[PDB]
Design a protein around this motif. Structure first.
Motif, PDB file in Angstrom:
ATOM      1  N   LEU C 116      76.003 -21.698  35.567  1.00 22.70           N
ATOM      2  CA  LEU C 116      76.919 -22.746  35.211  1.00 22.70           C
ATOM      3  C   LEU C 116      76.587 -24.052  35.957  1.00 22.70           C
ATOM      4  O   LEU C 116      76.746 -25.134  35.400  1.00 22.70           O
ATOM      5  CB  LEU C 116      78.354 -22.333  35.488  1.00 22.70           C
ATOM      6  CG  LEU C 116      78.968 -21.447  34.421  1.00 22.70           C
ATOM      7  CD1 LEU C 116      80.218 -20.797  34.969  1.00 22.70           C
ATOM      8  CD2 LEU C 116      79.308 -22.224  33.164  1.00 22.70           C
ATOM      9  N   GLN C 120      75.317 -27.477  33.927  1.00 25.23           N
ATOM     10  CA  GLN C 120      76.237 -28.590  33.963  1.00 25.23           C
ATOM     11  C   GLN C 120      75.887 -29.663  34.975  1.00 25.23           C
ATOM     12  O   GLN C 120      76.278 -30.790  34.778  1.00 25.23           O
ATOM     13  CB  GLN C 120      77.664 -28.125  34.180  1.00 25.23           C
ATOM     14  CG  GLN C 120      78.206 -27.259  33.066  1.00 25.23           C
ATOM     15  CD  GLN C 120      79.556 -26.736  33.397  1.00 25.23           C
ATOM     16  OE1 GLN C 120      79.716 -25.893  34.315  1.00 25.23           O
ATOM     17  NE2 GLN C 120      80.543 -27.216  32.707  1.00 25.23           N
ATOM     18  N   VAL C 135      77.461 -22.404  28.370  1.00 26.52           N
ATOM     19  CA  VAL C 135      78.550 -22.746  29.246  1.00 26.52           C
ATOM     20  C   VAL C 135      79.776 -21.955  28.850  1.00 26.52           C
ATOM     21  O   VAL C 135      80.393 -21.354  29.702  1.00 26.52           O
ATOM     22  CB  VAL C 135      78.803 -24.271  29.289  1.00 26.52           C
ATOM     23  CG1 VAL C 135      80.116 -24.599  29.955  1.00 26.52           C
ATOM     24  CG2 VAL C 135      77.637 -24.981  30.006  1.00 26.52           C
ATOM     25  N   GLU C 139      81.351 -19.124  31.212  1.00 24.61           N
ATOM     26  CA  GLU C 139      82.745 -19.323  31.672  1.00 24.61           C
ATOM     27  C   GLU C 139      83.603 -18.132  31.326  1.00 24.61           C
ATOM     28  O   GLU C 139      84.481 -17.760  32.099  1.00 24.61           O
ATOM     29  CB  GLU C 139      83.342 -20.639  31.125  1.00 24.61           C
ATOM     30  CG  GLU C 139      82.770 -21.928  31.760  1.00 24.61           C
ATOM     31  CD  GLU C 139      83.609 -23.183  31.530  1.00 24.61           C
ATOM     32  OE1 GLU C 139      84.409 -23.191  30.547  1.00 24.61           O
ATOM     33  OE2 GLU C 139      83.439 -24.157  32.296  1.00 24.61           O
ATOM     34  N   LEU C 178      80.470 -26.161  41.668  1.00 22.66           N
ATOM     35  CA  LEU C 178      81.276 -25.976  40.446  1.00 22.66           C
ATOM     36  C   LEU C 178      82.528 -26.866  40.388  1.00 22.66           C
ATOM     37  O   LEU C 178      82.991 -27.227  39.285  1.00 22.66           O
ATOM     38  CB  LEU C 178      81.675 -24.524  40.232  1.00 22.66           C
ATOM     39  CG  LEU C 178      80.497 -23.607  39.893  1.00 22.66           C
ATOM     40  CD1 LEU C 178      81.013 -22.162  39.765  1.00 22.66           C
ATOM     41  CD2 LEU C 178      79.809 -24.018  38.596  1.00 22.66           C
ATOM     42  N   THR C 183      84.099 -26.686  34.923  1.00 25.18           N
ATOM     43  CA  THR C 183      84.375 -25.281  35.282  1.00 25.18           C
ATOM     44  C   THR C 183      85.458 -25.167  36.359  1.00 25.18           C
ATOM     45  O   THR C 183      86.091 -24.122  36.500  1.00 25.18           O
ATOM     46  CB  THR C 183      83.076 -24.556  35.711  1.00 25.18           C
ATOM     47  OG1 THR C 183      82.118 -24.658  34.641  1.00 25.18           O
ATOM     48  CG2 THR C 183      83.319 -23.078  36.028  1.00 25.18           C
ATOM     49  N   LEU C 186      88.774 -23.307  35.655  1.00 22.24           N
ATOM     50  CA  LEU C 186      88.877 -21.827  35.842  1.00 22.24           C
ATOM     51  C   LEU C 186      89.519 -21.489  37.170  1.00 22.24           C
ATOM     52  O   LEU C 186      90.280 -20.513  37.259  1.00 22.24           O
ATOM     53  CB  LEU C 186      87.497 -21.158  35.695  1.00 22.24           C
ATOM     54  CG  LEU C 186      87.111 -20.876  34.197  1.00 22.24           C
ATOM     55  CD1 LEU C 186      86.778 -22.158  33.456  1.00 22.24           C
ATOM     56  CD2 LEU C 186      85.864 -19.980  34.073  1.00 22.24           C
TER      57      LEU C 186
END
Ligand SMILES: O=Cc1c[nH]c2ccccc12
Ligand SMILES: O=Cc1c[nH]c2ccccc12
Ligand SMILES: O=Cc1c[nH]c2ccccc12
Ligand SMILES: O=Cc1c[nH]c2ccccc12
Ligand SMILES: O=Cc1c[nH]c2ccccc12
Ligand SMILES: O=Cc1c[nH]c2ccccc12
Ligand SMILES: O=Cc1c[nH]c2ccccc12
Ligand SMILES: O=Cc1c[nH]c2ccccc12
Lengths: 211, 211, 210, 206, 211, 211
Positions: C116, C120, C135, C139, C178, C183, C186
């Motif tokens: 990820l 990204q 992605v 995720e 992250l 993301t 999350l």
């Protein structure tokens, strides 16, 4: 024994052939080709199939490969025994062509999608591999489109090629047997003619024999 | 009550734990988890391991999962019985760290490659699936690079972490048992110290018990 | 003394750096220039024949693999700075619980978090477009892992029990990256995970390496 | 009469066209406008619910799937023009051998050939690791064909059949690409390609 | 406020600009854009380049982006200082056009291939990623075709556009600097005029300054 | 021997050159290169362009290739007639640089996306292929982002590079001519300044001549 099948009993393609043989009440030997030892990629298997895939086949001196070539051969060579796997009037060219459409459809539209779904949901998971839910969703969408066509077709005809069970229906059986053990079963169940068709073809004795 | 392993006897990660238990001469029960029926992806297995991988483990009230956490626990909890799976001087921090390097190398450099090779060449074969030769060639090239490192390491030391057999060695055993039944075997046999090391660790009684 | 051979942006190098700062240890960070392939040449290969940063030295002791190094730090320097082991470090059961977490970080979190971050953040440097299907897939995997963490953090303050340990520490560098991506949602949508992230990333040793 | 609902450039449509020309049959090619999605709308969908060209009519008989259509042509118009079946068409063993080749074309050759032809024509004309991967696969296929053509004049035996015909349109496209070298490198494959592509029915659709 | 470059010192496109500035002995300030934090995709960088790519550039009030528009600007604006980056007779339209062919070739034929090769062989490694040897072989085959053309060209002329070093040559320098640190180097070394040309353009002081 | 264009009248890159020639009211010959027969990948075309792309070009003894090197040549060599394709003050270096930005943008941001959209929606048809709606959606999202930049730019200036029509605008025309025949037209019509700009540049007589 006249007839030998060189295959693997779990193989969708090997099962196609087996189901056709059982439909004709034929005696034969299944020789289980040892894939772990690369037997499929060595002589003498390569002289039966230079592409090194299962099944291969023998009926006396005749050597064949490709499951759908073998099933057609069985349906013609043993036409007057057991279940008729051709149309009721088998010499009717236009009716043959309608069955041929279905055989092509199974091969092109159904089998690749069904095979991916089986691999993702059955084969992988048994290892510890995580089933790729995006592949499953994408493939189920495709399969649903196919089964919508089959539903419309089975509203008009009892089986896919007309009034009677043929090679068209038979060729689907092994993949369907595997998919009925997965959540993809709902695609069959939610379409009422498709559901009846699946129930009928999978409950045949020849189908249960290979299961 | 007592030690239980929740797993499958053919599973590499389950065998890792089994081998450590037998090295310690411990009694335990192997409670069968039926992977073919997806039992690892259902309750109640998921309450033992929410990631749905075998093995899980119990030692009285202590509940564990992850094979390498379990083997470490065994090695420490039952340090004074059976085979010492730690370094000879287990309180030596710098020596522990050297073994820890090897454990990390097994988990990161060896296992994901070995697993792919076993899956391609053994597990696919069992279900009538065709091995992807490009994956095999790629993964054997990687494994050869790893084993070149091991060869150099084993020129200096009898086992990977020093003079004695430890967890570092043990963790490799199950994958190696499977790979010895494939053409990947040549990678081990063509490197003389790796070959001797393989012969020694696979001939241990605890190794032969799970085979 | 202590030397780390690595790169200050590297997730694996940062794991080791955090652990050293948690122990208030002095050390030198000897830069390994990844863009020039210095990790794949001598003399770095003689510290780590697998050509990955970090490598490590503490006097005559030579190590590689970030999680072997952090464990060594936690044991060797146990009675100083932050305790990175369980409160009772000689309790074998409790050690095993932490070990489960360390294995889970390594197997379930890190490979997903690393994809990820690459998709990204790192693709963008280089003129590559982020693959929105990767992605979404990653995720979905990360969410499943974080659901397990949420459940775990409802019962315990940190992952392995009542106190911050290596289990938590190992996650920090990937999480730092992250949090600079979408993301982040999350983490923020799971309340105990969100608190845990806020706590571990605000530690002074974490902020030092950022 | 006979109608083909398709597109003249379509490999699958050309398979059917070639078979018709081999039988010296009259027909109408009714153009299906793929660019406008005509293949994905009614009324085309009532000729083929899968929305692919070609569909086909011979009087009241309605068909789709190119290889079902060519088989139909070969049987319905068996005694006229070129025989597309085996010399003894009622010989079941010989039919099965041709059937193997038809399966091989569909499963081993076509998916590889079509992708290669399309990748490189568009690389070449419009500037759009696929080619190398697919050429390696095709070379393996053509190695099998080379061995087969050392024993037999054509793929299913001594005469030109549907097995050979089904390959023609993809081979026409590949001969306009550097993949041509795979055919020319293999002497029997090369002679086979030269023969099947020079047939007047093949040149008509080109 | 004099000349500023908004970019990153490792960026191929940024280096193109940097080399041109050094060739003209110009003073300037490299303003670092933090790509790892997405600064190139935020305001205020997006007001300098709405496509969010480095470099951007300022010379007093003049705001530019796109590395090759910048280098041409430098070559013209500062034509009578430092190295001439245009043709010796810069008002000769037919000679300019020949250089312009080369610039287009570098952009369309060389750069995308060189970039893929750098990414596969250098930058993938920085993250844990394995280089895809099929991409590398495909791209080297493309690059070899391009360098065959260059070899033929350099048999007739000292540099790509004629007798003197120009923007055509300069635009290749940064990608070549990276490729010389990979096995793709052999493509350059096996072609003698290309090899000389590489040696000459990479050993220039302006080139070594950014390296 | 006068001006010759070696190309194909349908080709986007050939049309770029043709439009520029017509803007200058130049006489020339279009020598047909048959792309369907691979003439662009054979001698003698390869001796005009060793990369095998149309167009190639000749103006007496001067031999060129790359459509954007050719249009620049036309704009300079014939600066003194017909439409001025350079900035009003063509010796103004800063203004030139601003136009150069736009030429780089057309080449890097617009053309690859516009070319893909024309291929999917128009030229796939020629080979009997179906348009991939997912590619069309992805590429239209990209094109919309580019056209948002153009919309902002055209709020400030009448054309892309300033007050007057230049090469920057001209380079876009042939791709736009094709896209106006497709549903992608809505992207241009939705954006009022883009819409006006398209209407103006496509209604020019030189534009209409190549349709
Ligand atoms: O008429 C025999 C026949 C028709 N189709 C097939 C297919 C396979 C073997 C024989 C036959
Ligand atoms: O089996 C004949 C057939 C004709 N139309 C369809 C459509 C879908 C499946 C099968 C068939
Ligand atoms: O087991 C410790 C160890 C230390 N260096 C290496 C290297 C490779 C495998 C294992 C080891
Ligand atoms: O760190 C301890 C731990 C124990 N069980 C789990 C499960 C998931 C993450 C962490 C842990
Ligand atoms: O056409 C029949 C045939 C039989 N074996 C092979 C093998 C390869 C191509 C075709 C054939
Ligand atoms: O002679 C000036 C000039 C600037 N750019 C180009 C491009 C092509 C030919 C000539 C020129
Ligand atoms: O730089 C000028 C040039 C002219 N023709 C070619 C061809 C290939 C590379 C460069 C050039
Ligand atoms: O043609 C000049 C120009 C300057 N900035 C932009 C931005 C987008 C398209 C063109 C241009």
């Amino acid at each position: 024994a006249g007839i030998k099948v060189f295959g693997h009993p779990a193989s969708i393609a090997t099962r196609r052939v087996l189901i056709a043989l059982h439909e004709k009440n034929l005696d034969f030997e299944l020789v289980h080709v040892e894939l772990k030892d690369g037997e499929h990629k060595k002589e003498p298997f390569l002289s039966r199939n230079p592409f090194g895939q299962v099944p291969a086949f023998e009926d006396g001196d005749l050597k064949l490969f490709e499951s759908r070539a073998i099933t057609q051969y069985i349906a013609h060579r043993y036409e007057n025994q057991g279940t008729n796997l051709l149309q009721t009037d088998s010499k009717n060219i236009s009716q043959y062509a309608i069955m041929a459409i279905g055989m092509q459809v199974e091969d092109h539209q159904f089998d690749p999608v069904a095979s991916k779904l089986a691999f993702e949901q059955i084969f992988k998971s048994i290892y510890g591999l995580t089933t790729d839910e995006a592949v499953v969703a994408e493939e189920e969408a495709k399969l649903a489109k196919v089964l919508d066509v089959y539903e419309a077709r089975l509203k008009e005809f009892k089986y896919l090629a007309g009034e009677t069970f043929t090679l068209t229906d038979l060729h689907h059986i092994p993949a369907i047997q595997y998919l009925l053990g997965t959540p993809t079963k709902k695609l069959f169940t939610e379409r009422p003619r498709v559901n009846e068709w699946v129930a009928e073809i999978t409950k045949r004795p020849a189908s249960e024999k290979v299961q």
